């Protein structure tokens, strides 16, 4: 399963770099995706909404940021 989730990981990171947000937002979302993909090591359709809501919590207040973040995780 390591190959599978690592493919997903690299894909979403590449998508993060291309996003129209400051490097701080990229930094936050990237570390969140790292944590989620390495706490797989450590309610079966809603994971796509759990992962999405965990990694994009970094936006918090601003709704704008939630937008681009979720868009990253849809594709």
């Amino acid at each position, epitope marked *: 399963v390591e190959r599978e989730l690592r493919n997903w*990981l*690299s894909e979403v*990171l*590449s998508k*993060i*770099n*291309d996003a129209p947000v*400051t*490097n*701080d937002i*990229k*930094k936050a979302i*990237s*570390n969140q995706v*790292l944590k989620v993909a390495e706490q797989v090591w450590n309610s079966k359709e809603e994971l796509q909404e759990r992962v999405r809501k965990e990694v994009c919590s970094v936006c918090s207040n601003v709704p704008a940021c939630w937008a681009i973040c979720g868009g990253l995780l849809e594709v």
Partner: antibody
Amino acid sequence: QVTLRESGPALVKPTQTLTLTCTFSGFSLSTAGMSVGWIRQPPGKALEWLADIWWDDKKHYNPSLKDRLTISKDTSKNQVVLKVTNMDPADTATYYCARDMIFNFYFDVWGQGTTVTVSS
Amino acid sequence: DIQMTQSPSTLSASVGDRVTITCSASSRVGYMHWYQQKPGKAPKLLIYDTSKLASGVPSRFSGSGSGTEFTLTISSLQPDDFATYYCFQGSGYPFTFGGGTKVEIKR
């Protein structure tokens, strides 16, 4: 263990072109989120960021050296190459290459640095 | 752009004193990192993000701040803390360092 090492000439005559090669081990520029940047330091001056390269071949340069910087990455050989053109005598400096990550957005592991002197 | 002034530019303090260097930006910036550079050696990461010690840095080093004002502090100055400390920012291109702060030991 991450380790970078710069290489290049010790001397370039003014208006020549400087070719610096960062050779790294301990990580790869193909793996996601990775990056390598070039920071130089003139004698008795502060640090100055020049360029950086990412695993997705994205590139950024300091605007102060507009048009004179071209960075390139060769993941096969584990090398990055900065090429600075139209070398002035004020660009005499020690040039460092350092590693960067999209998680960090700061340089953690630096090379030892290579000193280049612009003179006749 | 995004540019930062450190103060003081230089400072002398006896061994054991609390010393604080202030890096102040020209824009709201997410984080502020700190590098320590010994003479004729490569810079070393001292404080990453804003308050996190890089590997090996002794507990005497603390970092703090937010928005447009940040500080690096040494609780008790050691003789081995002779260095030049540069603040660094990575939240907005181009990456910029502070002017620099030379820390000399009063003796």
